[PDB]
mmCIF file of C-alpha atoms in Angstrom:
data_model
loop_
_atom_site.group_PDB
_atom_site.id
_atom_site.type_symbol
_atom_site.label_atom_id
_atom_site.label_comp_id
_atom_site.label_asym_id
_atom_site.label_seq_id
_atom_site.Cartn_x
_atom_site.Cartn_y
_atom_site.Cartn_z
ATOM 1 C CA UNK A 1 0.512 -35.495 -50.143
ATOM 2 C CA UNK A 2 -2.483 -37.823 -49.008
ATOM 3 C CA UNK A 3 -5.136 -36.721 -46.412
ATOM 4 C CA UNK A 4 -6.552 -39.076 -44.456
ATOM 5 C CA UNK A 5 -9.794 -38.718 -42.399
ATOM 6 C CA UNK A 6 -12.146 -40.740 -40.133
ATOM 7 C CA UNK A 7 -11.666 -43.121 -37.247
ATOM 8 C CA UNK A 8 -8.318 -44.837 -38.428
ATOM 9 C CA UNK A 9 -5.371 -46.110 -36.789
ATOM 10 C CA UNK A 10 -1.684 -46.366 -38.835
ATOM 11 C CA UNK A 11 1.918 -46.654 -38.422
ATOM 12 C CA UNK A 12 4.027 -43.739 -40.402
ATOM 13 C CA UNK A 13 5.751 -45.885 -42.549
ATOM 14 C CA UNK A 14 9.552 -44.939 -43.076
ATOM 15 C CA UNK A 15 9.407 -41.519 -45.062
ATOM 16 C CA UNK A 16 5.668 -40.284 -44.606
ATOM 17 C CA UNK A 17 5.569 -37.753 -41.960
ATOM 18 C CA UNK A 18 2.400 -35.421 -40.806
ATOM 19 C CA UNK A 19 2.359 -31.928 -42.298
ATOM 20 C CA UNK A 20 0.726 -30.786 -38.993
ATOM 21 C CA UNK A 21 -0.242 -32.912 -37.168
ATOM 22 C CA UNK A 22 -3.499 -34.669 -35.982
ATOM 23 C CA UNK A 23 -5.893 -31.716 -36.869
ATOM 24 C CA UNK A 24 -9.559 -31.488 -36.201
ATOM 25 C CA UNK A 25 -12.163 -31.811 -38.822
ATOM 26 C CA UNK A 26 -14.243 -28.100 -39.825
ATOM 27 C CA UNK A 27 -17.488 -28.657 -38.555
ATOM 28 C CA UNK A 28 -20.053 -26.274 -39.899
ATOM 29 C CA UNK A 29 -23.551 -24.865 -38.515
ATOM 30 C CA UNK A 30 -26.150 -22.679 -40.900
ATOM 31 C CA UNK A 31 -24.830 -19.718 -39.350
ATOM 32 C CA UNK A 32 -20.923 -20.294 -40.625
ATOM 33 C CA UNK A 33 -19.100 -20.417 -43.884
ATOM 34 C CA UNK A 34 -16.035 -21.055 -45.028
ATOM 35 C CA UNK A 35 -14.388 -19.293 -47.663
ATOM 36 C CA UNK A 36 -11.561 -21.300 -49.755
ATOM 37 C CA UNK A 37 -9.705 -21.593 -52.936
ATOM 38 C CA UNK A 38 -8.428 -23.963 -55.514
ATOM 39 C CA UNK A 39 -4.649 -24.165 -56.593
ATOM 40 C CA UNK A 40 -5.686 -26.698 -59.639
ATOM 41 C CA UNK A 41 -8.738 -27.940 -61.958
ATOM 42 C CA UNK A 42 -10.595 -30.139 -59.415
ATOM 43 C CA UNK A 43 -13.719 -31.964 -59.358
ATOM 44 C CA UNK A 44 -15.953 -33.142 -56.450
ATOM 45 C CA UNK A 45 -19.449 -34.913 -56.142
ATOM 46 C CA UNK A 46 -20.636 -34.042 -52.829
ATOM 47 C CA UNK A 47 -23.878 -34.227 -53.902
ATOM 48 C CA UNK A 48 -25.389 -36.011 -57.357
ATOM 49 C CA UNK A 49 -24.527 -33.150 -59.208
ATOM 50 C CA UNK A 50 -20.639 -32.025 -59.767
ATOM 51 C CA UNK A 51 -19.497 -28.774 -59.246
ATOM 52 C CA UNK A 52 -16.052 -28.255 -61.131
ATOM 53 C CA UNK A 53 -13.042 -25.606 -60.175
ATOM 54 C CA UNK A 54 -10.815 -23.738 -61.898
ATOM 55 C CA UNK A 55 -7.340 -23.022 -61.023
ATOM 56 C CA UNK A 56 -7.966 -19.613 -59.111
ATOM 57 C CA UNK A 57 -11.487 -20.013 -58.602
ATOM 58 C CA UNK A 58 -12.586 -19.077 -54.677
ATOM 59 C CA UNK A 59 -16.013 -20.286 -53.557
ATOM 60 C CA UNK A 60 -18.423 -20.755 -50.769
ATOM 61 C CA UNK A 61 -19.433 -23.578 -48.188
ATOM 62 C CA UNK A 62 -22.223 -23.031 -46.059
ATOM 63 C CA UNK A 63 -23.928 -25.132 -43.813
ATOM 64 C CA UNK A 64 -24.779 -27.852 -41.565
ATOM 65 C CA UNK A 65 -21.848 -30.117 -42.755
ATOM 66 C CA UNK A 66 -18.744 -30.982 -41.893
ATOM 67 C CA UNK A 67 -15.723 -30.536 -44.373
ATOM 68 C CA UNK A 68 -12.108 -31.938 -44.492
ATOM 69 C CA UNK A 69 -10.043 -29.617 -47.036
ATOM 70 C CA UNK A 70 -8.428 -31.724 -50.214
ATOM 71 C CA UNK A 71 -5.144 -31.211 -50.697
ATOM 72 C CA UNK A 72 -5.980 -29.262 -53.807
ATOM 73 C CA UNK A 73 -7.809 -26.621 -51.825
ATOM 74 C CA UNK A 74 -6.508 -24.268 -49.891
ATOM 75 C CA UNK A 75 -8.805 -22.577 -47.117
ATOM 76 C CA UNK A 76 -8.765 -18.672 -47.029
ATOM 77 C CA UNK A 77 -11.615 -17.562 -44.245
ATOM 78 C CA UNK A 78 -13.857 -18.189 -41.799
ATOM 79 C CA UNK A 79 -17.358 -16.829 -42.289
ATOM 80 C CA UNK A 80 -20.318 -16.163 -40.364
ATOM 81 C CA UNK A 81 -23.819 -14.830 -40.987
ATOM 82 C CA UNK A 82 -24.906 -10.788 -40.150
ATOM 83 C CA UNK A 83 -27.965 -11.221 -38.210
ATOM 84 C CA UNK A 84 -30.191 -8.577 -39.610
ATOM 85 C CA UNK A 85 -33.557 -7.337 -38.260
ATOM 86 C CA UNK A 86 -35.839 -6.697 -40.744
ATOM 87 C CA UNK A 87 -35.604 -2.742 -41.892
ATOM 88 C CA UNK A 88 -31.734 -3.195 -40.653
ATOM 89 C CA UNK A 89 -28.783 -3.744 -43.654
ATOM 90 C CA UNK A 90 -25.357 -3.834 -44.810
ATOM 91 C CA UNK A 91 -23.598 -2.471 -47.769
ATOM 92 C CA UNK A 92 -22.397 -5.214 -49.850
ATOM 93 C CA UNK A 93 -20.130 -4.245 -52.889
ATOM 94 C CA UNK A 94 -19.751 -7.454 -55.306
ATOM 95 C CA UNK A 95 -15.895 -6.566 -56.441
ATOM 96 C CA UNK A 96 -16.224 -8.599 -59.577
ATOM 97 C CA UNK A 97 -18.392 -6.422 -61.265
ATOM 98 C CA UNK A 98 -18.198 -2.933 -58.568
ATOM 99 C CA UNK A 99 -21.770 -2.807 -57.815
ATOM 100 C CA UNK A 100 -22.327 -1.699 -54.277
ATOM 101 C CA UNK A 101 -25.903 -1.989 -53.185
ATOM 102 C CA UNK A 102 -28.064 -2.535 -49.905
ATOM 103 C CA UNK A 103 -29.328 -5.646 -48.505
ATOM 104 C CA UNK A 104 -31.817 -4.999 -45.915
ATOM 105 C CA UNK A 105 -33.973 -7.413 -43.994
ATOM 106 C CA UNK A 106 -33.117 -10.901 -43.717
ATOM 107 C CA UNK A 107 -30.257 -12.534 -42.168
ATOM 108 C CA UNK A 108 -26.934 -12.602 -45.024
ATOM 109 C CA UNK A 109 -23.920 -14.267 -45.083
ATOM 110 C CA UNK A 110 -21.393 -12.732 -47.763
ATOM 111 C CA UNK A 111 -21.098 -14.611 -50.979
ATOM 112 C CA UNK A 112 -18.191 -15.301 -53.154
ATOM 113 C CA UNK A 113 -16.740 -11.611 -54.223
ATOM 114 C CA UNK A 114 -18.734 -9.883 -52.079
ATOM 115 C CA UNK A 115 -17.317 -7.508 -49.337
ATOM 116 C CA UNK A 116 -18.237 -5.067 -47.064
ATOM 117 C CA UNK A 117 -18.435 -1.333 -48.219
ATOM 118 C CA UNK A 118 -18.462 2.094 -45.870
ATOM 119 C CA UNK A 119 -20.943 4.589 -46.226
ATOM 120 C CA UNK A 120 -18.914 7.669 -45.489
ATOM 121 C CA UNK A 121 -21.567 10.916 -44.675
ATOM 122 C CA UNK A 122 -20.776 14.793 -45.054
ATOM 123 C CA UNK A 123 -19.528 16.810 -42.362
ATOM 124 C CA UNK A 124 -22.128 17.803 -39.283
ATOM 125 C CA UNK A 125 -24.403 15.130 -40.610
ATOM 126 C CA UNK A 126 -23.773 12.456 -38.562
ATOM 127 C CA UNK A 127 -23.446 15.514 -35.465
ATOM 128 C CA UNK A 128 -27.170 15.616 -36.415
ATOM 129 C CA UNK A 129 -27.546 11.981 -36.497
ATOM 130 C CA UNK A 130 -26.367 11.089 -33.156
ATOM 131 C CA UNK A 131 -27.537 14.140 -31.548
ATOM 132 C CA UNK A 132 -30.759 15.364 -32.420
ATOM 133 C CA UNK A 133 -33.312 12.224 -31.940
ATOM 134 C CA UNK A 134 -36.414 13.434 -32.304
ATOM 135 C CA UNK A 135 -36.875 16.959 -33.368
ATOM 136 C CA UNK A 136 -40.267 17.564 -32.200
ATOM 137 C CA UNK A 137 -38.443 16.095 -28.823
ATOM 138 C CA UNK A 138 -35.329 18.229 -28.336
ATOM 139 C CA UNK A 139 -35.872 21.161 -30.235
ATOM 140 C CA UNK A 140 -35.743 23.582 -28.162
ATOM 141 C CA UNK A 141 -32.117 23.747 -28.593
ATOM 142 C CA UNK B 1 -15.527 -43.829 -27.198
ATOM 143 C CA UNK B 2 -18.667 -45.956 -25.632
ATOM 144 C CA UNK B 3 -21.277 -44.260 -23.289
ATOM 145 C CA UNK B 4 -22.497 -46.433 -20.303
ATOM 146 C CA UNK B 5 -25.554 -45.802 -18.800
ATOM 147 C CA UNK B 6 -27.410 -46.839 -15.495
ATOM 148 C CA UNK B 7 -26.871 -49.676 -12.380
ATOM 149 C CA UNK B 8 -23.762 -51.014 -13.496
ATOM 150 C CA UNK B 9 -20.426 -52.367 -12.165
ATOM 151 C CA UNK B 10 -17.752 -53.303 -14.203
ATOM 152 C CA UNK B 11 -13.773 -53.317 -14.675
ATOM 153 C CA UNK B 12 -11.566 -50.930 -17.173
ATOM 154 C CA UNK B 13 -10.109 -53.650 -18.827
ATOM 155 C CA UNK B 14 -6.490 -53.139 -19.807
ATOM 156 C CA UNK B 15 -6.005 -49.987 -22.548
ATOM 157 C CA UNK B 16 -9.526 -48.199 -21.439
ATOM 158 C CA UNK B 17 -10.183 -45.456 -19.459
ATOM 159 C CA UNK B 18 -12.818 -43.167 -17.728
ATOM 160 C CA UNK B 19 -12.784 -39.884 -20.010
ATOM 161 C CA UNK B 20 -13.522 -37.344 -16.631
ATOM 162 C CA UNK B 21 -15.123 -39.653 -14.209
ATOM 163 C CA UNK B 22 -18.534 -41.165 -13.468
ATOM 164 C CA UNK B 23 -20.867 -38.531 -14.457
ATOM 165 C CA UNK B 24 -23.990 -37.533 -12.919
ATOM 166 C CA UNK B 25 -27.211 -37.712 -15.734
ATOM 167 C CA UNK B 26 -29.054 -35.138 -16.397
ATOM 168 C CA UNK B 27 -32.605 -34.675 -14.823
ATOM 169 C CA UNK B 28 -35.240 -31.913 -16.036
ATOM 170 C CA UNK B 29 -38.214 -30.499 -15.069
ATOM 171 C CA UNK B 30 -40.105 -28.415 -17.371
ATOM 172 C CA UNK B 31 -38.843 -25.377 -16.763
ATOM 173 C CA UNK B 32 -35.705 -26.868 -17.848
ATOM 174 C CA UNK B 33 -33.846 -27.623 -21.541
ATOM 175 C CA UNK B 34 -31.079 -28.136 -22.612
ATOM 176 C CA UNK B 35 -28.907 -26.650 -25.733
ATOM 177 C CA UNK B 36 -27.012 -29.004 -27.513
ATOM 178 C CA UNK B 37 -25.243 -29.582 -30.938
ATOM 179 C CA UNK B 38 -24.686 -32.389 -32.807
ATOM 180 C CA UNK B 39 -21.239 -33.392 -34.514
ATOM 181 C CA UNK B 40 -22.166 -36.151 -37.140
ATOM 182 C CA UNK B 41 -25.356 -37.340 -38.897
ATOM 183 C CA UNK B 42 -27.422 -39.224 -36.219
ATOM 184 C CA UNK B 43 -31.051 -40.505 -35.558
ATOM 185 C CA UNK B 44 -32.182 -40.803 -31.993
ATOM 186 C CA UNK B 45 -35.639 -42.625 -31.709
ATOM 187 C CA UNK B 46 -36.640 -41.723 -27.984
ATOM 188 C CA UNK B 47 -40.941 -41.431 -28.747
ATOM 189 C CA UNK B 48 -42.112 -43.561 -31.816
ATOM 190 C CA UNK B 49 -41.118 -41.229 -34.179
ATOM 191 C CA UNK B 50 -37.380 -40.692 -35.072
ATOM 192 C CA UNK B 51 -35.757 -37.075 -35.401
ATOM 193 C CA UNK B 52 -32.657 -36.960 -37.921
ATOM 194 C CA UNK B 53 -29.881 -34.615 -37.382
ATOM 195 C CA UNK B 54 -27.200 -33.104 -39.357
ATOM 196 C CA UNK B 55 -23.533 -32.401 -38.671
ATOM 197 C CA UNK B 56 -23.760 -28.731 -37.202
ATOM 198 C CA UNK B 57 -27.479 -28.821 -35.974
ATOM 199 C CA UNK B 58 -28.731 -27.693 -32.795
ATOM 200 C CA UNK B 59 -31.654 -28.410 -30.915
ATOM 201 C CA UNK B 60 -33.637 -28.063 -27.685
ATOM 202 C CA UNK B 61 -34.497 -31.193 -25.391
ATOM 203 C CA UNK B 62 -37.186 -29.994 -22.917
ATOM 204 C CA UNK B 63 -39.606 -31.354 -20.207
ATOM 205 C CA UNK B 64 -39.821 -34.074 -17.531
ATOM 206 C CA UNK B 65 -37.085 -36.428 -18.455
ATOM 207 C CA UNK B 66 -33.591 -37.762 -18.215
ATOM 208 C CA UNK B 67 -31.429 -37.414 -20.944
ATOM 209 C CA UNK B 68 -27.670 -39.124 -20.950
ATOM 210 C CA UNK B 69 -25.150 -37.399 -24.135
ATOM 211 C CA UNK B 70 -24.100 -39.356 -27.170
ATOM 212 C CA UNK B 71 -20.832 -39.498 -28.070
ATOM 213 C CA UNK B 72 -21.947 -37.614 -31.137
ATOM 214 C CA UNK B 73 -23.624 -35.220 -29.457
ATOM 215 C CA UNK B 74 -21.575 -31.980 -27.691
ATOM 216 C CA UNK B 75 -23.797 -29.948 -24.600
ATOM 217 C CA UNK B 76 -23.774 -26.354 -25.478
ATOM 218 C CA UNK B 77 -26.061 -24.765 -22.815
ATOM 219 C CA UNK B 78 -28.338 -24.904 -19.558
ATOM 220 C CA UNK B 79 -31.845 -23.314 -20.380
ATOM 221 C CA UNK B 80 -34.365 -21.854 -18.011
ATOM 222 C CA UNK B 81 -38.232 -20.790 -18.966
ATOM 223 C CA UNK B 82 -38.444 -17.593 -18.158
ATOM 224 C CA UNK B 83 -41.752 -16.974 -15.542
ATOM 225 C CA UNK B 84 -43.393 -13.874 -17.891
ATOM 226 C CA UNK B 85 -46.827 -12.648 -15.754
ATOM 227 C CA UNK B 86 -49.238 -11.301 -17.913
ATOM 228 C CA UNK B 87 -48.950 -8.195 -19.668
ATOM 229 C CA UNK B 88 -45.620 -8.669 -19.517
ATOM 230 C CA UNK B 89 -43.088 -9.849 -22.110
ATOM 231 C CA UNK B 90 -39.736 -9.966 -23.651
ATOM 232 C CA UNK B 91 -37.843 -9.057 -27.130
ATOM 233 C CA UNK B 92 -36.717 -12.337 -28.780
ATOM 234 C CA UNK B 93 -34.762 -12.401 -31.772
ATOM 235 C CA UNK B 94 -34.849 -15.404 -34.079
ATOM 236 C CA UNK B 95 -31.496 -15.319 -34.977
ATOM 237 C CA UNK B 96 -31.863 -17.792 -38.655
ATOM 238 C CA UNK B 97 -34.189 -15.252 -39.883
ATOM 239 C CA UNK B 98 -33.511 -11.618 -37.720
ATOM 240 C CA UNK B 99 -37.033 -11.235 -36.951
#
């Protein structure tokens, strides 16, 4: 396969053929990520430094950029930041090593291996969650 | 795609085309902006100073003015001030942060 990208008009010469069709370039604010993994050892310079893939290897891209997927790269998932007040969070659990945690305050996009974990409560707590607001309120009953 | 601006007559030569129409510009007064997103890397030297955007950015163009889009810049949203009296206020949330 060869991608091509940018303003450019061609002719399919007799055997090339479009694997979809004219698609539309992933454009990318602070507030999204994409998610996507390799299929073979691959290197790219975006920057001046290189960052180098393994064959499996997911990763990140965050940001305001646009990004055209290689043809070594697959793309698994769309991401967007959690907008979190401060003394509001998520549970995170990073499934590479199992360690679910908090992250409370800032804003927080999920990283590589990260996912979201459920904080399941014991029976008639959350009834006393919902419910009973402020005690020295409603506690008459 | 080219963006023509102002008093102006001319002919679509043979192949071009008008992508919805002649377009009315858009005015502001200052309790006015506008919400709008860029789609490439682009510099746009309206004062003496020039302001540099990336491919994703957004920004907010307010005040007395006219503004016409660039072809690499996409319109998002209409903004209004909002007339707050005194002793009065609202809850904003700054959305990059959470604050």
């Amino acid at each position: 396969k060869r991608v091509v990208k940018g303003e450019k008009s061609f002719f399919l010469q007799p055997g090339e053929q479009l694997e979809q069709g004219i698609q539309d370039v992933y454009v990318l604010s602070e507030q999204q990520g994409l998610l996507l993994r390799a299929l073979q050892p691959l290197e790219e310079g975006e920057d001046e430094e290189k960052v180098s893939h393994q064959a499996g290897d997911h990763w990140l891209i965050r940001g305001p950029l646009e990004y055209v997927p290689s043809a070594k790269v697959e793309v698994v998932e769309e991401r967007q930041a959690i907008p979190l007040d401060e003394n509001e969070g998520i549970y995170v659990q990073d499934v590479k090593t199992g360690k679910v945690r908090a992250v409370i305050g800032s804003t927080y996009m999920l990283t590589q291996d990260e996912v979201l974990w459920e904080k399941e409560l014991p029976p008639g707590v959350e009834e006393l969650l919902n419910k009973g607001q402020d005690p020295l309120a409603d506690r008459g009953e």
